[PDB]
Amino acid sequence: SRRRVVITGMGMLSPLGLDVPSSWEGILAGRSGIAPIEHMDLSAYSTRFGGSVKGFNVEEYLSAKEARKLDLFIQYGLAASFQAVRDSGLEVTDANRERIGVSMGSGIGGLTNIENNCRSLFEQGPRRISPFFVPGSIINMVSGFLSIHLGLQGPNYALTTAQTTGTHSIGMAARNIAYGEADVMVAGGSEMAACGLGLGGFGAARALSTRNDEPTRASRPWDRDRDGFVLSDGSGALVLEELEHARARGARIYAELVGFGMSGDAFHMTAPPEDGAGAARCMKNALRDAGLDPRQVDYINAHGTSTPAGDIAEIAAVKSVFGEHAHALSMSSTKSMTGHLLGAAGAVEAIFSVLALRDQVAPPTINLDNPDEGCDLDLVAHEAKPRKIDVALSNSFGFGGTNGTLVFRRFA
Amino acid sequence: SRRRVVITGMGMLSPLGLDVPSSWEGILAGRSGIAPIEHMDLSAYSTRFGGSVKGFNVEEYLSAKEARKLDLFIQYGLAASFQAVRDSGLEVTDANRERIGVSMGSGIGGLTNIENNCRSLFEQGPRRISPFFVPGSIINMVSGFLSIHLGLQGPNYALTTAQTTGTHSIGMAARNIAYGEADVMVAGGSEMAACGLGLGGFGAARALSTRNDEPTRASRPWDRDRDGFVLSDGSGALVLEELEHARARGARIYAELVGFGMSGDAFHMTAPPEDGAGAARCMKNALRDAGLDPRQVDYINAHGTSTPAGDIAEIAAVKSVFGEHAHALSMSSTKSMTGHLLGAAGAVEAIFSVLALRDQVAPPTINLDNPDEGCDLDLVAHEAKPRKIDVALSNSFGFGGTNGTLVFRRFA
Numbered sequence: 001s002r003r004r005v006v007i008t009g010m011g012m013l014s015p016l017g018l019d020v021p022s023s024w025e026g027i028l029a030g031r032s033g034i035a036p037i038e039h040m041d042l043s044a045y046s047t048r049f050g051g052s053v054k055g056f057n058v059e060e061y062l063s064a065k066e067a068r069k070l071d072l073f074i075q076y077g078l079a080a081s082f083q084a085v086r087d088s089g090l091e092v093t094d095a096n097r098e099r100i101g102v103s104m105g106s107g108i109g110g111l112t113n114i115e116n117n118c119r120s121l122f123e124q125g126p127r128r129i130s131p132f133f134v135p136g137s138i139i140n141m142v143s144g145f146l147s148i149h150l151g152l153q154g155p156n157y158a159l160t161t162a163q164t165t166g167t168h169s170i171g172m173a174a175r176n177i178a179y180g181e182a183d184v185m186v187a188g189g190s191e192m193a194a195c196g197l198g199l200g201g202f203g204a205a206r207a208l209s210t211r212n213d214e215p216t217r218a219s220r221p222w223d224r225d226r227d228g229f230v231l232s233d234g235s236g237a238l239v240l241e242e243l244e245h246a247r248a249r250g251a252r253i254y255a256e257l258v259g260f261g262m263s264g265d266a267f268h269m270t271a272p273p274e275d276g277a278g279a280a281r282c283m284k285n286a287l288r289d290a291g292l293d294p295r296q297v298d299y300i301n302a303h304g305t306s307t308p309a310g311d312i313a314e315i316a317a318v319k320s321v322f323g324e325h326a327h328a329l330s331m332s333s334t335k336s337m338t339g340h341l342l343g344a345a346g347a348v349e350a351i352f353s354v355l356a357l358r359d360q361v362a363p364p365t366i367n368l369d370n371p372d373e374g375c376d377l378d379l380v381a382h383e384a385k386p387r388k389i390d391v392a393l394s395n396s397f398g399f400g401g402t403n404g405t406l407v408f409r410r411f412a
Numbered sequence: 413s414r415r416r417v418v419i420t421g422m423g424m425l426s427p428l429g430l431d432v433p434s435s436w437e438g439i440l441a442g443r444s445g446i447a448p449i450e451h452m453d454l455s456a457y458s459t460r461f462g463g464s465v466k467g468f469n470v471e472e473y474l475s476a477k478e479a480r481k482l483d484l485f486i487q488y489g490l491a492a493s494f495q496a497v498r499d500s501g502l503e504v505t506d507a508n509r510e511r512i513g514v515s516m517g518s519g520i521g522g523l524t525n526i527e528n529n530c531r532s533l534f535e536q537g538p539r540r541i542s543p544f545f546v547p548g549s550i551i552n553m554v555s556g557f558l559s560i561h562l563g564l565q566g567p568n569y570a571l572t573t574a575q576t577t578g579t580h581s582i583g584m585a586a587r588n589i590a591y592g593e594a595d596v597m598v599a600g601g602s603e604m605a606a607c608g609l610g611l612g613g614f615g616a617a618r619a620l621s622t623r624n625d626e627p628t629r630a631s632r633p634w635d636r637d638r639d640g641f642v643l644s645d646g647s648g649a650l651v652l653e654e655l656e657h658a659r660a661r662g663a664r665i666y667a668e669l670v671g672f673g674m675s676g677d678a679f680h681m682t683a684p685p686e687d688g689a690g691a692a693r694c695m696k697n698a699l700r701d702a703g704l705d706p707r708q709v710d711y712i713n714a715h716g717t718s719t720p721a722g723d724i725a726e727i728a729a730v731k732s733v734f735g736e737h738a739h740a741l742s743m744s745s746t747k748s749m750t751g752h753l754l755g756a757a758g759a760v761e762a763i764f765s766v767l768a769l770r771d772q773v774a775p776p777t778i779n780l781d782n783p784d785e786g787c788d789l790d791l792v793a794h795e796a797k798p799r800k801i802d803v804a805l806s807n808s809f810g811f812g813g814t815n816g817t818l819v820f821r822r823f824a
């Protein structure tokens with residue numbers, strides 16, 4: 001048998017806000033966090049906008065000196081992680097520190113730092129590279145710095161599954177607890193890829209929306225005029241906790257994590273199969289893992305990236321899995337508002353799925369002005385929809401055909 | 413309930429050879445794979461040598477058309493993966509492809525490609541960034557491309573835990589199989605960090621040996637004249653398989669994976685604690701996972717990086733875990749010959765540990781002329797030691813205080 005896993009703490013930086021409740025208030029108001037990117041010359045670039053974190057103050061978390069050692073994606077991951085641990089109320093002690101671990105990941109990691117050190121190297125040679133270049137840029141340093149700061153001695157690792165990272169991180173941390181390898185895990189992801197290399201790299205693949213004139217309308221999942229994803233920054237962290245451990249200390253429980261699915265498309269490096277066969281297998285695996293019938297699902301937080309092929313693949317996958325129930329559930333893309341946080345997408349979207357359960361409301365897909373051919377599901381166009389939600393899924397489908405699905409259920 | 417996991421296939425690129433047998437022949441012969449680096453001009457750098465893969469032919473494995481899109485760390489990881497799958501004898505079918513996954517990780521990933529594209533961006537503009545920059549550089553694309561080429565539809569992910577990556581990848585892939593999430597996993601790691609930013613960044617930390625005038629003697633684990641690690645390139649991959657699945661198809665079984673441990677030091681971003689407390693916690697976790705008496709351990713493939721603090725921490729940890737038995741087991745660092753393959757170190761060293769079991773021989777720690785204060789175990793100085801090996805342990809320790817231990821034993 002397996003132990004039950006609940007969510008007792010959440011933390012976030014997003015284009016909508018510097019914490020969970022501010023972000024969530026924006027989500028339910030249909031607000032966009034997308035704007036032209038500042039303090040960066042994007043003249044030569046085909047995309048000049050994205051989802052930036054606005055007004056982040058790292059000195060609320062770290063000394064200026066410890067912050068100078070760390071790439072922005074690590075700063076953002078630590079901010080979300082500290083928020084989540086605070087929100088959980090957990091007290092770390094010599095009696096439990098070997099049972100508390102971390103799995104905070106990233107899709108792309110320390111591009112900003114790599115960029116800034118390339119500048120030093122090309123202009124002046126290697127002797128100007130920062131001594132902290134390597135430890136301050138590598139993806140496992142959110143887990144690393146968090147464990148050092150809070151004295152966590154439990155499983156310490158980091159996933160990097162591109163746009164699926166935050167979903168896999170949470171799911172695998174839930175397995176650690178379910179199978180008795182930990183009692184508490186801090187899990188999620190962070191990303192800051194708004195650099196020449198990120199906007200330039202995705203731009204060279206022509207993967208991004210180029211709707212420079214109306215950035216807030218760029219991210220329009222399932223709309224017939226969508227023209228690719230919107231690049232966004234931030235972080236999400238959850239405190240996962242074994243149920244008896246949470247009840248023993250009187251934790252506030254937001255929701256239960258009942259299912260995790262993984263699959264590989266084995267199809268293409270960047271594009272999903274048109275029928276979303278891999279996304280369907282992954283959702284079916286997550287529902288089997290939860291012991292739930294597709295008919296019990298009420299709300300899906302889609303991957304919903306605003307790419308032509310990805311959005312239509314998800315509709316096909318949901319129709320395949322859910323059959324006569326596919327129209328009864330609500331499915332929305334919060335990427336319509338936040339843009340695509342890449343490795344942090346699944347982390348912030350797990351939090352939005354948990355809050356959909358808490359508040360009994362489906363967040364909107366904004367900009368869904370003209371649903372495309374066959375996009376005839378309840379996609380919660382334009383405005384939040386209060387409804388019964390007992391079971392919420394969150395899907396991530398990333399480069400390499402790597403899929404993840406989380407299943408959350410109301411706890412009582 | 414938890415299933416047993418065996419090793420049925422192995423694959424490798426190392427500084428000693430373009431496959432497993434050639435690498436292992438070098439290991440048992442005490443041969444060094446370390447030499448001045450030829451692929452770039454390092455005259456401005458404090459370290460100008462390392463463990464390169466010599467004469468790698470990507471067209472043994474991939475079309476030159478596909479190879480051109482991929483960073484060397486991806487090409488190396490695919491080469492080792494393909495070798496391991498071929499060595500396993502496994503045939504991928506519609507009946508089993510959903511039950512076969514992949515977890516190939518990296519510590520740093522596509523730093524050469526990112527550097528080269530940063531040079532394009534800075535010198536020429538964003539329009540000269542490769543369209544393949546993201547899928548050809550990000551760490552999950554070994555798992556991704558391997559799944560696409562072989563049709564693996566099982567769990568598809570990647571770890572990035574710095575110098576612990578290969579050990580974590582193999583251990584977690586074993587748990588996937590143990591817990592029923594997959595019947596087969598291809599797991600390991602790959603690394604090619606020998607670019608300006610890699611050698612420059614580890615050089616800026618003063619972490620690397622600077623023995624430029626005698627590179628084969630630079631890597632000298634536990635030697636009083638050691639002065640840091642040697643940077644090395646390559647890949648290890650193993651096919652892990654559920655025992656009854658292997659038995660049912662008449663697989664050749666090299667060894668059984670009986671134990672996996674993780675722990676966090678929670679001490680320092682880069683420095684190991686002198687007392688090796690986290691490494692000891694990790695080994696004890698792994699031995700308890702394997703249901704072993706510590707006296708059963710015959711051979712330890714150490715992390716053995718040739719750093720002052722790391723090498724002595726490992727002696728302290730082994731003495732703390734094994735007590736008087738610390739004097740009966742054999743422990744060696746194959747990094748004395750291969751150098752430090754970073755995220756691939758744990759993968760090649762797991763293969764060396766399995767071959768120690770197959771051949772009943774402890775590989776040497778070459779260059780151990782003058783063991784340092786307290787370094788008074790059997791460290792297999794200079795020459796391979798034939799001996800009884802029923803149980804072999806492979807340790808890895810990384811930045812962020814992240815520790816992993818694998819326990820292998822003979823299978824009859």
Ligand SMILES: C[C@H](N)C(=O)Nc1cc(C(F)(F)F)n[nH]1
Binds near residue numbers: 081082085149150
């Ligand atoms: C004393 C040390 N500077 C520290 O920050 N402790 C700390 C932070 C947190 C939380 F909840 F934010 F994660 N708990 N405990």
